[PDB]
Write a protein that binds this DNA or RNA. Structure first.
Length: 231
DNA sequence: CGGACTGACGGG
DNA sequence: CCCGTTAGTCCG
């Protein structure tokens, strides 16, 4: 924590650490991260305390503060970094895509990636759909499952603005993956989009290959709409 | 497989 | 209060 705002946050969080809670919290993330043991409601209040005392740093320091928090060992600091990014939301634009990519592929797990993709990247590609093809093909072709998950989930909240052809093309590229985080993301995005257009999702899952997990997750609700044919 | 439950977080 | 959801564990 070079930056004084980050140092203040580190000190304040550490003073309220809970080693008893940190153990199960770390186990929940498969022990990929150390935890201080601070859950979301308190963690947000502790951040708020520091903002009240120091004020939110000038936007010139935004990316710097995020990266410094990203570099700290305990997972709460990445969660706090994401809370802070939201506070700078109106300053984030298409020029930040590489910055967001780097966040996705460092300290990677489902918690951070899910908090970056459908919101920050989703909003950017909604305003600049013409940039999708500058990134999505690379993400799918990469060795990185989190970039692949990003390609699937960036349209999660699009509803009626969903690009169906694009969605199904992306899923087609990834449908053979044996990776849980890919199979489940496919299930999730289809389940969610089915809330907007159930007929299109139903037809897709009945007529295109998917991992068993992806298909069952996709239709967990809409199977009530159409029924389950006797085998 | 995949269903039932555990659970913290989001938000109607 | 309601119910949705990332995950997670447990079991036939």
């Amino acid at each position: 924590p070079m930056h004084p705002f980050v140092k203040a946050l580190q000190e304040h969080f550490t003073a309220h650490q809970n080693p008893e809670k940190a153990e199960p919290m770390a186990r929940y993330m498969k022990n990929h991260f150390l935890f201080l043991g601070i859950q979301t409601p308190e963690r947000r209040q502790l951040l708020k305390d520091i903002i009240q005392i120091h004020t939110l740093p000038d936007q010139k320091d935004f990316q710097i503060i995020i990266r410094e928090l990203w570099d700290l060992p305990e997972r709460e600091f990445q969660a706090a970094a994401l809370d802070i990014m939201q506070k700078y939301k109106k300053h984030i634009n298409e020029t930040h895509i590489p910055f967001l990519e780097e966040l996705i592929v460092t300290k990677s797990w489902w918690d951070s990636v899910d908090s970056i993709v459908p919101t920050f990247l989703g909003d950017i590609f909604l305003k600049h759909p013409e940039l999708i093809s500058a990134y999505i093909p690379k993400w799918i072709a990469s060795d990185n499952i989190w970039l692949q998950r990003a390609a699937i989930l960036f349209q999660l909240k699009y509803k009626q603005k969903m690009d169906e052809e694009l969605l199904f093309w992306i899923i087609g590229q990834l449908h053979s993956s044996k990776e849980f985080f890919i199979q489940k993301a496919i299930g999730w995005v289809l389940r969610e989009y089915a809330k907007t257009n159930p007929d299109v999702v139903w037809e897709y899952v009945q007529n295109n290959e998917l991992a068993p997990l992806s298909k069952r997750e996709a239709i967990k609700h809409i199977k009530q709409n159409y029924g389950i044919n006797n085998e």
